[PDB]
Amino acid sequence: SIEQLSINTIRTLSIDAIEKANSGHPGMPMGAAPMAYTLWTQFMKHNPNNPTWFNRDRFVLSAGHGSMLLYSLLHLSGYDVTMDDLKNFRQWGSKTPGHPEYGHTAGVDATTGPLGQGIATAVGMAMAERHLAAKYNRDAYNIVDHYTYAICGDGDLMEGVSAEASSLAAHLQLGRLVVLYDSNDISLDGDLNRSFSESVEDRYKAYGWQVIRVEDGNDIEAIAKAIEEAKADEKRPTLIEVRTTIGFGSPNKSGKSASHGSPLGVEETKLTKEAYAWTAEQDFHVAEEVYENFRKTVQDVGETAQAEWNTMLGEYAQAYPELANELQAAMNGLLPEGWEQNLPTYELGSKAATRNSSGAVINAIAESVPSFFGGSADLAGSNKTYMNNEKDFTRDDYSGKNIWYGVREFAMGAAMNGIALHGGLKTYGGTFFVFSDYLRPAIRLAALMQLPVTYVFTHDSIAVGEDGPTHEPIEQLAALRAMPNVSVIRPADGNESVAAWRLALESTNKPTALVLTRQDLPTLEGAKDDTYEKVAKGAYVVSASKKETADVILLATGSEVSLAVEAQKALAVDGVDASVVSMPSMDRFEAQTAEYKESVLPKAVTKRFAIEMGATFGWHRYVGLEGDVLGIDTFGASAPGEKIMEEYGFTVENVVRKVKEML
């Protein structure tokens, strides 16, 4: 009956916070408060005074809309989420935003809301945990050893991304992933049965998960049994279908979707509190006995767990000083001193496809940077992402560094977020640039969360050639350039692409999309010296005009810079004096100083011509009303890459003509 009291406090806090905000989702906090309370207080190892503890159990509220459930538990458990925080649910500047936000609220492990992704993120977190354990754990010292938990709803399990991530998690046999499914026959919009009649249990057994059913979500002893069972089966990831009733306790709107997405309201709140034998007559009431219960079951237990872990760690250090030092540095995102010495250089006269350049870099990194971990969505041979002297990450060897994601772009993107969130690893994921659209929503969460993951997007243009328009990117550059807090770098040759990789690996608070070619690019002279400082500025002058004042500026990126440089000679002959600007990254250029920008794009020179095999959208920021751009505003074609390029106008002859045309 104290557990019951605690459960009803969670319920009642949630409801009251939502009444006060006059916004929010009360229904599932009420249905799910029991299973959540049981997991949080009886199974999870976590320290409310140190939410950042490396070996804490991880937790993901995949069903984001139920955020008050998480906020309640955090507050009641002694995390730094106060009563005044709860009373500011969904308000400007809150620590209690409408959906959970990693980095903004103490104890929130991931940002959820977009449905399905929380589960896939958790799958990434569980990958990181076994990978780190294999790398770092030794005799006695189970230094990395924890579980990964999530709570989801019906929506989550309809989304393809959760389907992909579950297939994957089963294949890697991630036995410490445990997902609690709030199964209540209601969706965002009405009865589940309006969209949904599949057998979740049977699908998950088919993947290869353990599934365990709980008939009565209000039965704590049963949920507790299922989790015990979940945790003893280290072989399979486990799903626990917990049968609950949405808005439990609301007489009028319990059974209904009406209870899902808006405050139950003053009269119905009173009635609900009745139904709970909730006598407390002030809102936001929590009994001393309830705090005490959480202090006993969560705070004291996590405290002790953490203290022992720290003692183990100190012993681990003496017994394995260099190993423990490496781990320390990895947990802190520090790259080893001098790691970049390893990297390729491309000599004047060489030719390299930037996907190949990227592969050579990836191999030099795997050798010099112990925290590197990544793979491809089933395109390893085409993306060049494979670490040739590293093992595969598998159910049989969690220490392998090469991940085989299969044809699961979206789950890949979301797992990468989970890998980064965990800490202790630098990750990357490869697919064809044209398929970046498949994982777009995960990129956006990586941007929101400030996660420094790296995407290896190859086959970046119509130069892809025979595969045709469904495989040729056109608008993909603009679609990422417009997104807040993503860096997009499209290197113009081998050396720019080594600098690009350094910038991606060095990132701490934003994802980096590397945009790479299928086809060979000529090593540029203007790029060879101080490439890193050049690429770091985002745009620099790769080939100066003759006078301090150019007749025209050619701007180009990636594979079009070489083109721009030939055009430049061709124009010199005809008495036109061009400078060439290489712009491997618009976002980095934009962050530079008014004085630096002005030194690369002189305001008095209005004659500017951008060249890029992609949408023209975005280029007028640089070329203005009086400049022009050679880009591509239609889809591509199926033909040898160089034939499309010629037909689409990417030839010196055409650039010279279009340029002479506008001055």
Next chain:
Amino acid sequence: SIEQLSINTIRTLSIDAIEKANSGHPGMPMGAAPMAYTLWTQFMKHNPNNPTWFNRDRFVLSAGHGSMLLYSLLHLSGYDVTMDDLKNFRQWGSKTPGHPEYGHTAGVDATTGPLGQGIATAVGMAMAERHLAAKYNRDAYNIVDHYTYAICGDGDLMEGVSAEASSLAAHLQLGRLVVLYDSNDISLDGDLNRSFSESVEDRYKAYGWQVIRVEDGNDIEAIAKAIEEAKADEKRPTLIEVRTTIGFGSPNKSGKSASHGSPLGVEETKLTKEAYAWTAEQDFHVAEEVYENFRKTVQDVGETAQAEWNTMLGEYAQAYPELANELQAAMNGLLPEGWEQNLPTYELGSKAATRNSSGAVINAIAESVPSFFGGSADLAGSNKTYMNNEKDFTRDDYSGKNIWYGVREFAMGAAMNGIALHGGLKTYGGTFFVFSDYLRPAIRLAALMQLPVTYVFTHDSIAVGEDGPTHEPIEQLAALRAMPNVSVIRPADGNESVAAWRLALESTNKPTALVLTRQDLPTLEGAKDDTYEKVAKGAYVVSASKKETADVILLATGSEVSLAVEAQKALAVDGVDASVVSMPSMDRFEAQTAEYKESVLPKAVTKRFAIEMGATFGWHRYVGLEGDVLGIDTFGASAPGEKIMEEYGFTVENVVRKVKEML
């Protein structure tokens, strides 16, 4: 037998076309030839001489890299794909591009290539078939009565979109969808089991599909029985797992991912032709009897079938003339005369949220345009997409026009494509604008295929308020505006709204995204008269500068136009004379004459200020180097919408101030 010879003509035609192109995917045509031959030859009714026949069985090559298999079949059975076309596989301008392209090659029902989507598009075609039968069907007369077939591979079933579509196809008990699964233990990059170990069969049963397995994929007999078996169970969809060996016949690369996506090579194709007992010495050899075998099994069968169907149609028109007439108009994409007569109007001084505005138009269209069919990804309540005077589309009533997609944005997008492809129906689908990201690859295929589907994207800005940054679009406008052949319309009020919908329904060759507000917008004096004509222009002067040439032009779209027109009056008080341009749609504006454009945005007026709650990316096309934009280049926040709007600078006083600063 003549079957085996016909089957190996498919094989060799495919091999040699790839040899000659020196590019392509030999592996699957080799392994899948038997199964595809059996389906095409012994089950599908289709008339090579009329690929457009409304009641043919539809076919989707979801595993699009296997295009030579489809092209071989089309040629051999007498569709307008000639031998020379085959000899120009993957060549510039040819009718045989590397992945199938709808509208480019006779008898290709859908564009495929991006994996997984083919299946989800098939699901939509099957949804159209059934809906259309229930609407238009009658006694004796089976006007709409056909099947939907696809062929997919391992990759397709790892993709989340095929999971979502399959779940939904099961829910709807689309009994006339049969997917042939080329199951060969080889994915794109190596052994299937490096990434994949799930039970596909058990998963599909779990959803509610029928799974028939064919143990030996060379057994025409066994495959044929499976298909019969699929066609008497009109209760659920069927998945037939056909076990094949990729690159069957190849000695050094059969069974290996090596046969997947490169030409066999000149001497390895020698050995393979050896293994088929293929003796011909010229390259693209088709023996006379093979042609005839196809003429008997496909052409003759197809013509008789179409003739019989044509007569039944004759009887139908005599027996239900007004109905028959309706069907005819639908199949020809014709909107009824005066359909737009009951279209809502908003009087000066009124208010309307464009999602409600849109809701009103949707209901008015369901009344007056009988080919309408659409729904929401579980957000009918919030998107306002529901037709309140229409029934729901269900396994028990396909006459229902209201579709319930569930939480499956991607599958809904691809299904809509399948619906538009079928013919007979005008579709739309709704979700939060922030989640357009989820169905992006399907929007791209819609743009590619020139399908006039309509997206209802509501909740378009940080005005969404409390739900927070994961739910507040920023970059979604730019991301769509950059893509070729998509129209994007962001109505500035209720009237601009109604016009947008008309332009959308009137579309015939491009998807239209409607970008709609959760919050009320004030009806605009300048938009009130000739709304349709103004919006059709893309951008127009919504309230004039007092004077010949303005001091400044204010550009705005959607919910920002009113802020702009208010800025314009505060600016007037202060001595600055501004005109206000509403741009509901940048793409429509760009298509206007140079002279129309000059009238809205005179090249003389260089002081131009853009205002929009979304990335600033792209605006410089209009405001140039000398102008400015007030937009949002960070993520949003969790707070009342009003409050986020003020904090992010969207107030009269801040607009007036930033304009003065650029004067």
